[PDB]
Design a protein around this ligand. Structure first.
Ligand SMILES: Nc1nc2c(ncn2[C@@H]2O[C@H](COP(=O)(O)OP(=O)(O)NP(=O)(O)O)[C@@H](O)[C@H]2O)c(=O)[nH]1
Ligand SMILES: Nc1nc2c(ncn2[C@@H]2O[C@H](COP(=O)(O)OP(=O)(O)NP(=O)(O)O)[C@@H](O)[C@H]2O)c(=O)[nH]1
Ligand SMILES: [Mg+2]
Ligand SMILES: [Mg+2]
Ligand SMILES: [Mg+2]
Ligand SMILES: [Mg+2]
Lengths: 179, 346, 179, 346
């Protein structure tokens, strides 16, 4: 089976859920813990319109202190997943300040999918009370699509790894893009 | 093979802890990682930037180039930074200079961003410290109206003040703030109080208070420490502090605690110096001698005289001067010994 | 002088100031009146980097009742100016609902410049009081640039014909685009 | 040449006034305009759409096609619409049907948008009126949860009610609303009251009240007019009206005035009918005769009996029945003669 294989590297602010997304697609267990990734890579398989297509998943540290480490991962990417947490406007604001200049610098003309994580937190009672304390509110869909247009991404999908909402669609689009 | 791996780990600016998880991977994974690293060594070299920065670009062109240089200083092997080296820096600050003689700030800001990335590491901070205008130029970068650049510059200066290796770093910094202030018709903690003002982003407030603490904490001398506290306190720092104390912000909360507690301790201590003086100099024979030795022919003199002069405004005849000095003394004590004592309105 | 001539058609909600913009560039008098355009066209001349370049200006009715009239104007456009009033969120909302589907339908692959008019009203005392009465506020720059990205325009410039702010730049970009 | 120009002006759906300014232009300008018009006669023909609409597309594909058909019906020569004609419409409503048997609304909405464009003109409204399900299908399109489509459908129906040319148009419409309501277990002005509810867009509220007025204004019969007012009023329309009366909105303000004043006049008039009846039927001999002729063997009967039955609950013996009927009468009068009289709670 001389299957088609494409590289997907995923990046974004520490703790906005880059790893859970990956893991939920594959083994199918949500980790309660939170161990920060330095450098890890998985292989998936995914459907697109009659095709079985291997997907080489490259997971990266979200933390600042690993900035000189990350370009180890970019060399021949076919498609990026760029993430932010929906419970975190700050994590969004980093899309044009940090994550875009970075990705365009190391992977020029690599399609990007802007992805809002932790969708389930949008209507979360404790979350809202907490975001209020800072003169803020969760990310609005509207805000997320406007950003994707601004960085001229391939698109915007939102999801929650915890409930598995919108996930299967996240990876289809990415498969679809690297083509 | 594990030789390269050390080389790599050094080149990535990671402390001991950060390095832990990379040390635990299988040699097979360690082997991919040396070959990624060996390959990736996605833009122009050091010297190719240094030239762009010398051909004097302007506008979108400068920014376009600075935005890219930012990402390299930021994401490349520490070694790349060393190639950029003393020169890159000197021409970075060259641009910064020539820019202020226009007083876009997008450009000034980007340079700072670069500098931040450059100092990011041991080599960087060293080379920055040897520069003539580095510190001064960061200080010039604290402009309240351009808030985010003020934040970045502030932190960068705060990191400096706390450096042990070269002595009296806080003072290096403070001198730069002093200099610029004489250079305008302005008070040296003016930009800091300005950034504490309400309706500036919380982020701006925090890092303002952070620099104040950074200037005071590391100082070995009580005197310096009570001194500069009082300067701020004189200029209304207490009042500007009050409406901050209600902001639910983890960082803002931490700086207020550091600030408050600094006050208590410093001033509990000054009081304990008083207790000593009270034993040493228990009469005018001791007092007179100190003045003649310690004030008389120094630049402290005219200010000292002026105080004695104010203390002897009352007529000698006045039927209640005892009662009057018992009073003046409580005021003077408050002025010198309470940590918000220089306040225009207690 | 075998000068270069390009067609600029301008469209947008009735009364958001399509005509004043045109007239201010040319004769240089702001009309106090407001006579609604049915169909009018002017010729301008404009600088771009060493060049004198004639600009064929096609002015259109903003009113609904002239919808079957307007395509008379579109036939060989080189660049559109698409407008909304800054004192009118409603006038903005019509950018994707009406004016975009229309322009892409009749002029496909014609560059678009999204233009916010009456900039001077943004900080206008009476305007704000009036927009409040409707649970609204003037257009934010931020809102205007996000829209241009969404319709994938060539760009966004704001201006006020009344004060002439940002005007010269409006027409330069358009000249620049049709090239 | 001015022949074509008339042809053109007719083909552009312009009333007399709208046409004024086009008539004032120089023949030289009129000559460019005939040649633009002659040329532009930027997509597929009528029959090319009609086919797409028959090959049964779904999802983005249907919308993609409907969005484009929308722009044509909207921006082309009225003549194009006539080519689209009875058929286009029949297949447009075909899609709409098959869609409801899924109960995307983006699709249903687009069709409405098309229909709006189609009825935009004299030819359109005529052909829509000859359709079996047209009106009914617009009515099905008033869904509060899909607000903007409700607005569009509402207006389109309001325009209909006000048409003189074919008689009793409001009734055509009302029948459709009736039908659908029997078709669910639901009250016929339910969707209208629902759209008046607070926290629905002002635009939704306005057009809701607009349809209510459109149903009532054009009616020639006082009876119809007091009747349907009371139905709404029974279902709490008065209460839903109260918090609207404070919205500063030019349109909302206009519909309330039309509504209120309708009430006064209608009911001032009913009272004046009472004055007549009071002269005609001044005793039970007249009353008894009316009942036997006019109520007795009609579908009004069981309801009438039931009222008489409630009016004679009191024992005949009761020492105060005069006082009791003087009272019942004021109630009954309010129920029948005050314009918010059917209110559950006055
Ligand atoms: N509500 C909610 N929480 C989530 C979701 N996904 C992850 N989390 C939680 O938020 C944290 C994010 O974990 P992780 O997936 O490791 O994020 P990461 O971005 O890979 N971390 P790093 O930046 O260090 O690589 C964890 O505590 C996790 O349990 C989600 O979809 N919803
Ligand atoms: N404050 C302000 N008012 C303006 C400006 N430009 C136009 N106006 C006013 O707003 C109205 C708009 O006029 P006009 O230019 O004819 O708009 P238009 O879009 O061409 N009209 P139409 O849709 O009917 O063609 C006029 O009353 C005009 O005086 C502007 O830049 N600022
Ligand atoms: Mg992770
Ligand atoms: Mg101590
Ligand atoms: Mg006009
Ligand atoms: Mg009358």
């Amino acid at each position: 089976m001389a299957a088609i294989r494409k590289k997907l590297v995923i990046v974004g602010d520490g703790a906005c859920g880059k790893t859970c997304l990956l893991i939920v697609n594959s083994k199918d267990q949500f980790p309660e813990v939170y161990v920060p990734t330095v450098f890890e890579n998985y292989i998936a398989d995914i459907e697109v319109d009659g095709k079985q297509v291997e997907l080489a998943l490259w997971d990266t540290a979200g933390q600042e202190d690993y900035d000189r480490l990350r370009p180890l991962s970019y060399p021949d990417t076919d498609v990026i997943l760029m993430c932010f947490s929906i419970d975190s406007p700050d994590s969004l604001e980093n899309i044009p300040e940090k994550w875009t200049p970075e990705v365009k610098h190391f992977c020029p003309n690599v399609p990007i999918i802007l992805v809002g994580n932790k969708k389930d937190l949008r209507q979360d009672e404790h979350t809202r009370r907490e975001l209020a304390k800072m003169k803020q509110e969760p990310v609005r869909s509207e805000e997320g699509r406007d950003m994707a247009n601004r960085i001229s991404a391939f698109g915007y999908l939102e999801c929650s790894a915890k409930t598995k909402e919108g996930v299967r669609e996240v990876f289809e689009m990415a498969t679809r893009a690297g083509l | 093979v594990l030789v390269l791996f050390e080389q790599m780990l050094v080149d990535m600016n990671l402390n001991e802890e950060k390095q832990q998880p990379l040390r635990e991977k299988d040699i097979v994974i360690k082997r991919e990682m040396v070959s990624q690293y060996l390959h990736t060594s996605s833009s122009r070299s050091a010297m190719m930037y240094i030239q762009e920065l010398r051909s004097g670009l302007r506008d979108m062109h400068l920014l376009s180039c600075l935005e890219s240089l930012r990402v390299s200083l930021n994401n490349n092997p520490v070694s790349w930074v060393q190639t950029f080296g003393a020169e890159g820096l000197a021409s970075l600050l060259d641009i910064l200079k020539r820019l202020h003689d226009e007083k876009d700030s997008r450009n000034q800001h980007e340079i700072i961003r670069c500098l931040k990335a450059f100092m990011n590491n041991k080599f960087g901070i060293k080379t920055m410290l040897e520069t003539e205008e580095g510190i001064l130029l960061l200080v010039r970068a604290m402009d309240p109206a351009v808030p985010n650049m003020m934040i970045d510059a502030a932190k960068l200066l705060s990191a400096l003040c706390i450096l042990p290796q070269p002595e009296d770093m806080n003072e290096r910094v403070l001198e730069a703030m002093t200099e610029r202030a004489e250079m305008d018709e302005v008070e040296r903690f003016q930009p800091l109080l300005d950034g504490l003002k309400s309706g500036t982003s919380i982020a701006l407030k925090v890092g303002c208070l952070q620099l104040i603490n950074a200037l005071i904490t590391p100082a070995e001398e009580l005197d310096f420490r009570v001194h500069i506290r009082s300067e701020l306190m004189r200029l209304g720092l207490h009042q500007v502090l009050q409406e901050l104390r209600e902001i639910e912000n983890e960082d803002m909360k931490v700086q207020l605690c550091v600030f408050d507690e600094q006050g208590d301790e410093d001033f509990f201590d000054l009081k304990g110096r008083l207790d000593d003086i009270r034993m040493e100099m228990d009469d005018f024979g001791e007092v007179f001698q100190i003045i003649l030795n310690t004030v008389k022919d120094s630049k402290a003199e005219p200010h000292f005289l002026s105080i004695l002069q104010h203390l002897l405004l009352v007529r000698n005849d006045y039927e209640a001067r005892p009662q009057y000095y018992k009073l003046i003394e409580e005021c003077v004590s408050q002025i010198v010994l309470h940590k918000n004592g220089t306040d225009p309105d207690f």
